[PDB]
């Protein structure tokens, strides 16, 4: 299966606009996080499926725990949410050498404000001005009128919990 295009891509998508690649009809990192929900990872190699979906994005180190069923936080509630009955695997590895600039890497953003939480596998790419007060904003950012997206601004000297991490989520359909 063409997994090389997903893992070895030059640039990953922002978590708010996470990318999904459908893979069907087909057949390693130094230190990484690899776990599966609903099935053992030794048994995934012996299980036939019709389609496998690969979701890829970039988040902080300390946010990787949110990529799991039944979690909360800015990523799980406003960016990428998994259903409680999630059956798949989660892969995440350190990408500090690729997605960190001394002056700040502004390729990756996350949704910091939203009126409600995301449903599972819901994507929201809108950029409407978020109204935090009682007065309308009319599309003008200002006091109590926030732009809903925020940059990570990855720097190479940040701590391990603040370094950028590339995440791949594998869902299975059969």
């Amino acid at each position, epitope marked *: 299966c063409p997994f090389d295009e997903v893992f070895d891509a030059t640039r990953f998508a922002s978590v708010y606009a996470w990318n999904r690649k459908r893979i069907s009809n087909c057949v390693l990192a130094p230190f990484f996080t690899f776990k599966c929900y609903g099935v053992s990872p030794t048994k995934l190699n012996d299980l036939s499926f019709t389609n496998v979906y690969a979701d890829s994005f970039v988040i902080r180190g300390d946010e990787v725990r949110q990529i799991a069923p039944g979690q909360t936080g800015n990523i799980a509630d406003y960016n990428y949410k998994l259903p409680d009955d999630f059956t798949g695997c989660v892969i995440a590895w350190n990408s500090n050498k690729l997605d960190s600039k*001394v*002056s*700040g890497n*502004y390729n990756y*953003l996350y949704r*910091l*404000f939203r009126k409600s939480n995301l449903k599972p596998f819901e994507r929201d790419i809108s950029t409407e001005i978020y109204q*935090a007060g009682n007065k309308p904003c009319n599309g003008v*950012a*200002g*006091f*109590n009128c*926030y*732009f809903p*997206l*925020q*940059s*990570y*601004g990855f*720097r190479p*000297t940040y701590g391990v919990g603040h370094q950028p991490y590339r995440v791949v989520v594998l869902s299975f359909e059969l």
Partner: nanobody
Amino acid sequence: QVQLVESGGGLVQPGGSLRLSCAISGITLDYYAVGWFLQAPGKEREGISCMRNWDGRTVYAPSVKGRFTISSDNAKKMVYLEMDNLKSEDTGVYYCAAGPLPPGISCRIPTPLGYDDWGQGTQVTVS
């Protein structure tokens, strides 16, 4: 690591003036915001003025608009907060905060979210 150290403040009678300073260091981001937050007794941290670095655009709270002025020096080293016509409602602890910001986006107040580095705070008493 980023350091934000405040100076100034103290006791002042109503109607007087005061200037706070926020010495920033270690910020190499191309796009970031610097804001001032007021922690009134009983209330929590709320932004009253912020600015973005590249063009200096500022947004103020209605409580302080027309009386307070946040500014920066050319070297981008010191951020000031010029307080004029002070009143009892301005009493509290004042922090300066910094955080990343997307290009071409206005800085956010009064939310504390989006600011990753804070100062030690400064007590300002107007009575």
